[PDB]
């Protein structure tokens, strides 16, 4: 071997040197450019250099590689053969065996005046599988702010017709400006002139150069990229004959029943052609001389029960009302609850959002033509500079905004979070003008000479959508774009409506201002909210004709639904005084035009409502002394359920007295007693029944049924004991009134058969249980619980979130720029949570994406799911540290650097006096520092900044997401890796993004093998508490009804004697209700949420009201045959049954059918209409008939 050159004394122009000729033997490095060698090819190093190489060579051989670095090492394997063509070229130490120079002429020497040698042209032989491998490698990486090749940059050319021997011509070619004397390469793979060249080892585009860096990625290379992934949609219809096969199960089913059941009738009507009475004789017993105490001890009644009101309801004053959405819809000790309690006390709770989704409806999209070469690319209608200049005014003035607060200013500066601070301390705002830095210089300049722009504000776009986290466009701009807060912009928060990567197309701009949001602190959250108003205000005032802005605010939904949740106010007061009007109306039989307002029971029925209302009051009380807070659906549901039995118990007593005639030599108290001792155990019946029910249901964990259960079991009860005693005082004291001739309401001036008595009776009873009517009852009913059984399984689950706000509010129009607008959604974190260990091989395996940690990892798995990004609605990549954190401590990276002396950290920007590298720069550094060199140099990125010289830095994004515990080693704690959801739209979306988020963490921790349980991966994002409560709701439902239904049927069989097949027809009707209420809900689109369940462990009290007295007052009946005892039954019982609940909830509802809002027009106007007249019909209508059929004899 020798060489051919060495030194550059040579001038050929400018600063490029010609090497000076010397064919001796290779000379001995001189210990100075080690680090070059070692940087350049370090296939060289290996010490006992005799390299022919100088060190005033290597360090001008990098100045040339600048930007041919910069645009192929994006792809390791591509750069790395590049070199190889170059060490060789230049100073290989068998440099003379693959070289020939062909032209040199003498030089002068300014310095000695000795003739110096330079090096004027030379050919390179160059094998041909060396530039084929070359070549083919590097032709499918790609350019920085475009998508054409690489090499069309680098070829001097087209990048279309670029051969694999031309392009070596044109990089040794001086007519580029770049070589300083061209060389002329000879492709040969034999030897010729008894001269072989050179062909080193070779690697692709798939292979990797090393141990430590990954392979190239399938858009710098076409051969690593495979078939894409895909998940197998299931329907899951069964569709037995073409149809939904559960609407022809159940067709099938009811031809079934209508042929077995009408082909017995024409069957036969063409044959044709001890303790029991113990227990139910001990109670009348008891009420009757109950009664008499009560009818003539009125005083004494009326004071104790008004004390007992007044000191149960007094209670009041402790009143707390529940608006906390978490404590409303999370159950204290769920699976989410605790995982948002583990987030924010490790993580400090997730922060608050204001976006802004401005539009510029009048511009039009125009196109950009790159000034070289390339396709037109065209730019959205807000991506015009006068609208971004536009935006940018309108953001730098929602920075002003001040909003005054408690005698003090609340600037965005102040409640806005800087991750990196306090060294810089602007705040994250993310928006498109942070890749200008929100400065209208930096997005007006453009650089280039008339007729033509060299840049634009186009091609930084470009780039930085590209790489959101440059530091300097590095070409031709040089400026970067991380954000005056520090960290990368990412393109798919700050645009909409592009198709899959063109951000050019992009019709919005999403503008969000992240602000903390504080663990148990207040002072902090009123300063957030004090300046979140004045931002709604700004935001809601600012004309600019030229954009169309839809905002949101954190604290705007909850007051959008307090100013929804109001002015219908004056709609419920004017039912119940309907209610009461037909109340005080209704109590007194007429009888008679003249003696009106003296058979009235005006005064009885208002003693009657305050009776009610008192009740109500006194079970707030007494739970509001225990503790128990109250709620809006409480506050609605327990009135309309109280006042619906109370007026039920009322109407039962008043008109059983006044249908009763008076034995000769019997007085009052007596025939009041008695009356009472024949009415009451009925009323019992029913109030235990339902307070039975109730309290029982006190028994899920959702916050809406326990404290409905609660509440409801209380007042019922209460208003039971109230009626019994104060009602019937007040009903011997309104008989003496009407019997002394005393005049109605004002004062002191001195049998019936009611109207519809007579009418059930006379017309209705009979009629209803002839014999040709009883099938077709019975047929039409098992007809309509055939139809709701069938389309059972339609309902839908959860609330839609647009209707709880009014149609007049500024959230619709932000909820539909949402869906028809956004990109990604919100944002989720896979919390890995403390006692993982971090500082081994495998411990690091289990959580890499990267080259040799395993391909289940954690971080691999997220990517996966972001893959699919359609079945897992993950979008984005999970954005793992530990990856950034070996990248930054890589000693070819090298950001890190200790102090000598002191082992501290010596910042990359420092004058460099005698910091060395973290990890030396051999076989062994290379690797991840697994051992205590990772928890030596994790705390210093952290603290990192954002450096020019070094990159991005680990503090800006990661200081949050890993949590350190100092002493002891000193080990990591709990760390996550957050990535992003899919626009999430609705109900179904969101419990569809729950489930398989919580998916991929079960996979995970699996995977990582954990010995027990001692941690877990588990996702956490903002809507999961509020929508945990869908993914067990259907068998709560099961569960709440179940449980109810089984109470309701024990507590009848036992008091109303023991006949099991009275309870059993009972439990059926409101079995049947139910799930008629169901089929309801299912065909006027209502939804199954906390709100329809409360409705419906509500109704099941109210069949129980009509059920209960109509089939005791059939069993409890000495009459002979079963259709006598259901007539007679219906008449006296059913009477009092349709007149006091029936008319009453009816016109009640008949004036709530003028909501004005859409929850309640949807989930109480429609749920008590069908609720109320589905149970009367029902009981009304079937009871008759199924007793007269199938009855219990006696
Ligand atoms: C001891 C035994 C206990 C356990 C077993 C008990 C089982 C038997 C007991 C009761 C019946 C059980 C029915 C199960 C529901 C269907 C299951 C299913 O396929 O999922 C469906 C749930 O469908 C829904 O979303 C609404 C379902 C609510 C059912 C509640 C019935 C309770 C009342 C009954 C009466 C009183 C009950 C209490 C009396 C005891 C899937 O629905 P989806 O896909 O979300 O819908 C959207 C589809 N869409 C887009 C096309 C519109
Ligand atoms: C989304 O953005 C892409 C760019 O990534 C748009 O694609 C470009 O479409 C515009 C339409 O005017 C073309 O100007 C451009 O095509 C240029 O190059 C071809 C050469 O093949 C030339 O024949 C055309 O005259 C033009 O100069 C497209 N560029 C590329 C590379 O696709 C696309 O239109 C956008 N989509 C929508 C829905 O707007
Ligand atoms: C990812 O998301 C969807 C899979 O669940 C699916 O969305 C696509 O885009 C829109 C969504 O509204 C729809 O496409 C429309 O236009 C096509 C013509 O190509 C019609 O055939 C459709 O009926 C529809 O009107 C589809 O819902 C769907 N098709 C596309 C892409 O247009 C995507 O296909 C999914 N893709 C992947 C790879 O995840
Ligand atoms: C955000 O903080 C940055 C520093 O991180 C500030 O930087 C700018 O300061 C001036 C504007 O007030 C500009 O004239 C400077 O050119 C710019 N800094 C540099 C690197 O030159 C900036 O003030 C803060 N906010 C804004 C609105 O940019
Ligand atoms: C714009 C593009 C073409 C530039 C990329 C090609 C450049 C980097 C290539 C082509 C020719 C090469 C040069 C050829 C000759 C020498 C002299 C030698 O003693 C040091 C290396 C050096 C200085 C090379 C540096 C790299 C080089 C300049
Ligand atoms: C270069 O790559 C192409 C792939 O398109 C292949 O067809 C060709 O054989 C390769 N030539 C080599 C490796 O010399
Ligand atoms: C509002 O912001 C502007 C921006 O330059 C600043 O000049 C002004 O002092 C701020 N306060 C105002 C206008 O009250
Ligand atoms: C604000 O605080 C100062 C100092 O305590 C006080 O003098 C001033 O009156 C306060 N402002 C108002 C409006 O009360
Ligand atoms: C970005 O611009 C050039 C291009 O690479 C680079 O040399 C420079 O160091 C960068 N900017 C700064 C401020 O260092
Ligand atoms: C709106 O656009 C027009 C036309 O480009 C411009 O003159 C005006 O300043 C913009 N802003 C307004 C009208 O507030
Ligand atoms: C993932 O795990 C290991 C990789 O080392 C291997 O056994 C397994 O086949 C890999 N899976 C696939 C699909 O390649
Ligand atoms: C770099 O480190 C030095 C250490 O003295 C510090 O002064 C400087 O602010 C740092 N620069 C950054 C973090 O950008
Ligand atoms: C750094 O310290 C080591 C150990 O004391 C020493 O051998 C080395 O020469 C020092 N380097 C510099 C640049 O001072
Ligand atoms: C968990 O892994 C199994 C098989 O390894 C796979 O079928 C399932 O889809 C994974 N869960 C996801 C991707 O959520």
Same mark, same amino acid.
């Given at each position: 071997?020798?060489?051919?050159?060495?030194?550059?004394?040579?001038?050929?122009?400018?600063?490029?040197?010609?090497?000076?000729?010397?064919?001796?033997?290779?000379?001995?490095?001189?210990?100075?450019?080690?680090?070059?060698?070692?940087?350049?090819?370090?296939?060289?190093?290996?010490?006992?250099? +005799?390299?022919?190489?100088?060190?005033?060579?290597?360090?001008?051989?990098?100045?040339?590689?600048?930007?041919?670095?910069?645009?192929?090492?994006?792809?390791?394997? $591509?750069?790395?053969?590049?070199?190889?063509?170059? $060490?060789?070229?230049?100073?290989?130490?068998?440099?003379?065996?693959?070289?020939?120079?062909?032209?040199?002429?003498?030089?002068?020497?300014?310095?000695?005046?000795?003739?110096?040698?330079?090096?004027?042209?030379?050919?390179?032989?160059?094998?041909?599988?060396?530039?084929?491998?070359?070549?083919?490698?590097?032709?499918?990486?790609?350019?920085?702010?475009?998508?054409?090749?690489?090499?069309?940059?680098?070829?001097?050319?087209?990048?279309?017709?670029?051969?694999?021997?031309?392009?070596?011509?044109?990089?040794?070619?001086?007519?580029?400006?770049?070589?300083?004397?061209?060389?002329?390469?000879?492709?040969?793979?034999?030897?010729?002139?008894?001269?072989?060249?050179?062909?080193?080892?070779?690697?692709?585009? /798939?292979?990797?150069?090393?141990?430590?860096?990954?392979?190239?990625?399938?858009?710098?290379?076409?051969?690593?990229?495979?078939?894409?992934?895909?998940?197998?949609?299931?329907?899951?219809?069964?569709?037995?004959?073409?149809?939904?096969?559960?609407?022809?199960?159940?067709?099938?089913?009811?031809?079934?029943?209508?042929?077995?059941?009408?082909?017995?009738?024409?069957?036969?009507?063409?044959?044709?052609?001890?303790?029991?009475?113990?227990?139910?004789?001990?109670?009348?017993? &008891?009420?009757?001389?109950?009664?008499?105490?009560?009818?003539?001890?009125?005083?004494?009644?009326?004071?104790? +029960?008004?004390?007992?009101?007044?000191?149960?309801?007094?209670?009041?004053?402790?009143?707390?009302?529940?608006?906390?959405?978490?404590?409303?819809?999370? !159950?204290?000790?769920?699976?989410?609850?605790?995982?948002?309690?583990?987030?924010?006390?490790?993580?400090?709770?997730?922060?608050?959002?204001?976006?802004?989704?401005?539009?510029?409806?009048?511009?039009?999209?125009?196109?950009?033509?790159?000034?070289?070469?390339?396709?037109?690319?065209?730019?959205?209608?807000? #991506?015009?500079?006068?609208?971004?200049?536009?935006?940018?005014?309108?953001?730098?003035?929602?920075?002003?905004?001040?909003?005054?607060?408690?005698?003090?200013?609340?600037?965005?500066?102040?409640?806005?979070?800087?991750?990196? +601070?306090?060294?810089?301390?602007?705040?994250?705002?993310?928006?498109?003008?942070?890749?200008?830095?929100?400065?209208?210089?930096?997005?007006?300049?453009?650089?280039?000479?008339?007729? *033509?722009?060299?840049?634009?504000?186009?091609?930084?776009?470009?780039?930085?959508?590209?790489?959101?986290?440059?530091?300097?466009?590095?070409?031709?701009?040089?400026?970067?774009? #991380?954000?005056?807060?520090?960290?990368?912009? *990412?393109?798919?928060?700050? &645009?909409?409506?592009?198709?899959?990567?063109?951000?050019?197309?992009?019709? !919005?701009?999403?503008?969000?201002?992240?602000?903390?949001?504080?663990?148990?602190?207040?002072?902090?959250?009123?300063?957030?909210?004090?300046?979140?108003?004045?931002?709604?205000?700004?935001?809601?005032?600012?004309?600019?004709?030229?954009?169309?802005?839809?905002?949101?605010?954190?604290?705007?939904?909850?007051?959008?639904?307090?100013?929804?949740?109001?002015?219908?106010?004056?709609?419920?007061?004017?039912?119940?005084?309907?209610?009461? &009007?037909?109340?005080?109306?209704?109590?007194?039989?007429?009888?008679?035009?003249?003696?009106?307002?003296?058979?009235?029971?005006?005064?009885?029925?208002?003693?009657?409502?305050?009776?009610?209302?008192?009740?109500?009051?006194?079970?707030?009380?007494?739970?509001?002394?225990?503790?128990?807070?109250?709620?809006?659906?409480?506050?609605?549901?327990?009135?309309?359920?109280?006042?619906?039995?109370?007026?039920?118990?009322?109407?039962?007593?008043?008109?059983?007295?006044?249908?009763?005639?008076?034995?000769?030599?019997?007085?009052?108290?007596?025939?009041?007693?008695?009356? #009472?001792?024949?009415?009451?155990?009925?009323?019992?019946?029913?109030?235990?029944?339902?307070?039975?029910?109730?309290?029982?249901?006190?028994?899920?964990?959702?916050?809406?049924?326990?404290?409905?259960?609660?509440?409801?079991?209380?007042?019922?009860?209460?208003?039971?004991?109230?009626?019994?005693?104060?009602?019937?005082?007040?009903?011997?004291?309104?008989?003496?009134?009407?019997?002394?001739?005393?005049?109605?309401?004002?004062?002191?001036?001195?049998?019936?058969?009611?109207?519809?008595?007579?009418?059930?009776?006379?017309?209705?009873?009979?009629?209803?249980?002839?014999?040709?009517?009883?099938?077709?009852?019975?047929?039409?009913?098992?007809?309509?619980?055939?139809?709701?059984?069938?389309?059972?399984?339609?309902?839908?689950?959860?609330?839609?979130?647009?209707?709880?706000?009014?149609?007049?509010?500024?959230?619709?129009?932000?909820?539909?720029?949402?869906?028809?607008?956004?990109?990604?959604?919100?944002?989720?974190?896979?919390?890995?949570?403390?006692?993982?260990?971090?500082? +081994?091989?495998?411990?690091?395996?289990?959580?890499?994406?990267?080259?040799?940690?395993?391909?289940?990892?954690?971080?691999?798995?997220?990517?996966?799911?972001?893959?699919?990004?359609?079945?897992?609605?993950?979008?984005?990549?999970?954005?793992?540290?530990?990856?950034?954190?070996?990248?930054?401590?890589?000693?070819?990276?090298?950001?890190?650097?200790?102090?000598?002396?002191?082992?501290?950290?010596?910042?990359?920007?420092?004058?460099?006096?005698?910091?060395?590298?973290?990890?030396?720069?051999?076989?062994?550094?290379?690797?991840?520092?697994?051992?205590?060199?990772?928890?030596?140099?994790?705390?210093? *990125?952290?603290?990192?900044?954002?450096?020019?010289?070094?990159?991005?830095?680990?503090?800006?994004?990661?200081?949050?997401?890993?949590?350190?515990?100092?002493?002891?080693?000193?080990?990591?704690?709990?760390?996550?890796?957050?990535?992003?959801?899919?626009?999430?739209?609705?109900?179904? /979306?969101?419990?569809?993004?729950?489930?398989?988020?919580?998916?991929?963490?079960?996979?995970?921790?699996?995977?990582?093998?954990?010995?027990?349980?001692?941690?877990?991966?588990?996702?956490?994002?903002?809507?999961?508490?509020?929508?945990?409560?869908?993914?067990?709701?259907?068998? /709560?439902?099961?569960?709440?009804?179940?449980?109810?239904?089984?109470?309701?049927?024990?507590?009848?069989?036992?008091?109303?004697?023991?006949?099991?097949?009275?309870?059993?027809?009972?439990?059926?009707?409101?079995?049947?209700?139910?799930?008629?209420? *169901?089929?309801?809900?299912?065909?006027?689109?209502?939804?199954?949420?906390?709100?329809?369940?409360?409705?419906?462990?509500?109704?099941?009290?109210?069949?129980?009201?009509?059920?209960?007295?109509?089939?005791?007052?059939? %069993?409890?009946?000495?009459?002979?045959?079963?259709?006598?005892?259901?007539?007679?039954?219906?008449?006296?019982?059913?009477?009092?049954?349709?007149?006091?609940? %029936?008319?009453?909830?009816?016109?009640?509802?008949?004036?709530?059918?003028?909501?004005?809002?859409?929850?309640?027009?949807?989930?109480?106007?429609?749920?008590?209409?069908?609720?109320? &007249?589905?149970?009367?019909?029902?009981?009304?209508?079937?009871?008759?008939?199924?007793?007269?059929?199938?009855?219990?004899?006696?």
């Amino acid at each position: 071997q020798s060489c051919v050159w060495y030194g550059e004394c040579g001038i050929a122009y400018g600063d490029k040197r010609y090497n000076c000729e010397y064919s001796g033997p290779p000379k001995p490095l001189p210990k100075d450019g080690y680090d070059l060698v070692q940087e350049l090819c370090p296939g060289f190093f290996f010490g006992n250099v +005799s390299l022919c190489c100088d060190v005033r060579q290597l360090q001008t051989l990098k100045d040339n590689l600048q930007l041919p670095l910069q645009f192929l090492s994006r792809c390791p394997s $591509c750069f790395y053969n590049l070199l190889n063509l170059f $060490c060789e070229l230049t100073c290989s130490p068998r440099q003379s065996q693959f070289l020939n120079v062909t032209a040199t002429e003498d030089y002068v020497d300014p310095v000695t005046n000795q003739t110096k040698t330079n090096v004027k042209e030379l050919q390179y032989y160059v094998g041909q599988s060396f530039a084929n491998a070359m070549y083919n490698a590097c032709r499918d990486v790609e350019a920085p702010s475009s998508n054409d090749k690489a090499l069309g940059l680098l070829c001097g050319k087209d990048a279309d017709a670029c051969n694999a021997t031309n392009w070596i011509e044109y990089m040794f070619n001086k007519d580029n400006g770049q070589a300083p004397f061209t060389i002329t390469p000879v492709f040969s793979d034999f030897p010729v002139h008894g001269m072989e060249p050179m062909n080193n080892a070779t690697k692709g585009c /798939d292979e990797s150069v090393d141990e430590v860096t990954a392979p190239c990625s399938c858009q710098d290379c076409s051969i690593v990229c495979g078939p894409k992934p895909q998940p197998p949609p299931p329907p899951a219809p069964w569709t037995i004959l073409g149809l939904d096969a559960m609407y022809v199960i159940m067709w099938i089913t009811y031809m079934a029943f209508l042929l077995v059941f009408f082909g017995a009738f024409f069957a036969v009507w063409c044959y044709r052609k001890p303790v029991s009475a113990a227990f139910e004789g001990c109670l009348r017993r &008891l009420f009757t001389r109950w009664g008499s105490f009560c009818v003539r001890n009125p005083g004494c009644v009326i004071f104790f +029960s008004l004390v007992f009101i007044t000191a149960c309801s007094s209670g009041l004053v402790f009143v707390r009302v529940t608006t906390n959405p978490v404590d409303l819809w999370s !159950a204290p000790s769920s699976q989410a609850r605790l995982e948002k309690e583990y987030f924010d006390q490790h993580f400090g709770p997730f922060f608050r959002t204001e976006q802004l989704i401005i539009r510029a409806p009048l511009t039009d999209k125009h196109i950009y033509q790159p000034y070289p070469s390339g396709a037109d690319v065209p730019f959205g209608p807000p #991506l015009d500079i006068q609208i971004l200049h536009q935006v940018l005014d309108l953001q730098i003035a929602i920075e002003n905004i001040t909003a005054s607060y408690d005698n003090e200013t609340v600037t965005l500066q102040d409640i806005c979070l800087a991750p990196l +601070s306090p060294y810089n301390t602007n705040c994250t705002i993310l928006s498109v003008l942070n890749y200008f830095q929100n400065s209208h210089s930096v997005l007006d300049h453009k650089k280039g000479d008339d007729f *033509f722009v060299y840049a634009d504000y186009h091609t930084h776009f470009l780039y930085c959508v590209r790489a959101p986290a440059s530091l300097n466009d590095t070409s031709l701009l040089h400026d970067p774009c #991380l954000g005056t807060f520090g960290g990368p912009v *990412f393109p798919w928060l700050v &645009l909409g409506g592009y198709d899959d990567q063109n951000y050019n197309n992009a019709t !919005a701009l999403v503008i969000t201002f992240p602000v903390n949001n504080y663990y148990n602190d207040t002072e902090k959250l009123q300063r957030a909210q004090a300046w979140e108003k004045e931002f709604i205000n700004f935001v809601k005032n600012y004309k600019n004709p030229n954009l169309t802005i839809s905002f949101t605010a954190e604290r705007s939904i909850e007051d959008e639904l307090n100013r929804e949740s109001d002015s219908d106010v004056f709609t419920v007061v004017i039912s119940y005084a309907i209610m009461f &009007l037909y109340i005080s109306l209704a109590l007194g039989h007429m009888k008679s035009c003249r003696r009106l307002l003296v058979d009235s029971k005006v005064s009885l029925g208002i003693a009657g409502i305050l009776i009610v209302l008192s009740s109500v009051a006194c079970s707030l009380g007494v739970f509001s002394y225990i503790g128990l807070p109250l709620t809006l659906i409480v506050i609605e549901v327990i009135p309309f359920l109280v006042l619906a039995v109370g007026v039920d118990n009322i109407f039962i007593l008043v008109q059983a007295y006044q249908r009763d005639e008076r034995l000769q030599g019997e007085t009052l108290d007596q025939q009041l007693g008695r009356v #009472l001792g024949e009415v009451a155990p009925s009323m019992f019946l029913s109030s235990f029944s339902e307070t039975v029910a109730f309290f029982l249901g006190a028994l899920s964990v959702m916050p809406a049924v326990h404290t409905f259960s609660l509440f409801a079991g209380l007042a019922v009860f209460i208003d039971f004991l109230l009626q019994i005693t104060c009602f019937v005082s007040l009903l011997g004291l309104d008989i003496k009134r009407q019997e002394k001739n005393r005049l109605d309401i004002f004062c002191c001036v001195r049998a019936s058969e009611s109207c519809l008595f007579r009418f059930f009776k006379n017309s209705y009873s009979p009629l209803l249980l002839k014999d040709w009517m009883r099938p077709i009852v019975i047929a039409i009913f098992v007809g309509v619980l055939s139809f709701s059984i069938a389309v059972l399984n339609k309902v839908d689950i959860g609330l839609d979130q647009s209707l709880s706000m009014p149609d007049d509010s500024y959230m619709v129009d932000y909820f539909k720029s949402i869906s028809q607008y956004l990109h990604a959604g919100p944002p989720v974190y896979f919390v890995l949570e403390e006692g993982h260990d971090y500082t +081994s091989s495998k411990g690091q395996n289990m959580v890499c994406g990267g080259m040799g940690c395993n391909n289940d990892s954690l971080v691999q798995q997220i990517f996966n799911a972001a893959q699919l990004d359609n079945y897992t609605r993950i979008g984005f990549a999970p954005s793992s540290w530990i990856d950034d954190y070996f990248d930054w401590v890589k000693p070819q990276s090298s950001c890190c650097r200790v102090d000598n002396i002191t082992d501290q950290f010596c910042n990359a920007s420092v004058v460099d006096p005698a910091c060395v590298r973290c990890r030396p720069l051999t076989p062994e550094g290379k690797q991840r520092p697994q051992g205590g060199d990772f928890m030596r140099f994790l705390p210093m *990125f952290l603290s990192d900044n954002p450096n020019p010289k070094c990159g991005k830095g680990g503090h800006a994004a990661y200081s949050s997401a890993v949590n350190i515990l100092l002493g002891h080693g000193t080990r990591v704690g709990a760390t996550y890796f957050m990535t992003y959801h899919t626009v999430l739209q609705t109900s179904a /979306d969101f419990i569809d993004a729950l489930k398989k988020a919580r998916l991929i963490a079960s996979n995970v921790t699996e995977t990582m093998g954990i010995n027990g349980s001692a941690y877990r991966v588990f996702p956490y994002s903002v809507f999961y508490v509020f929508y945990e409560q869908y993914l067990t709701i259907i068998d /709560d439902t099961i569960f709440n009804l179940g449980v109810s239904l089984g109470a309701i049927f024990l507590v009848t069989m036992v008091l109303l004697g023991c006949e099991l097949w009275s309870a059993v027809i009972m439990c059926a009707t409101i079995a049947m209700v139910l799930v008629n209420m *169901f089929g309801v809900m299912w065909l006027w689109g209502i939804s199954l949420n906390a709100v329809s369940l409360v409705n419906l462990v509500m109704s099941c009290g109210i069949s129980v009201e009509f059920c209960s007295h109509i089939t005791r007052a059939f %069993t409890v009946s000495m009459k002979g045959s079963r259709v006598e005892r259901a007539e007679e039954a219906l008449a006296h019982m059913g009477s009092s049954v349709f007149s006091g609940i %029936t008319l009453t909830k009816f016109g009640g509802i008949v004036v709530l059918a003028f909501a004005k809002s859409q929850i309640f027009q949807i989930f109480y106007f429609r749920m008590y209409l069908a609720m109320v &007249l589905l149970g009367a019909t029902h009981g009304l209508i079937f009871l008759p008939v199924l007793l007269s059929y199938i009855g219990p004899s006696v």
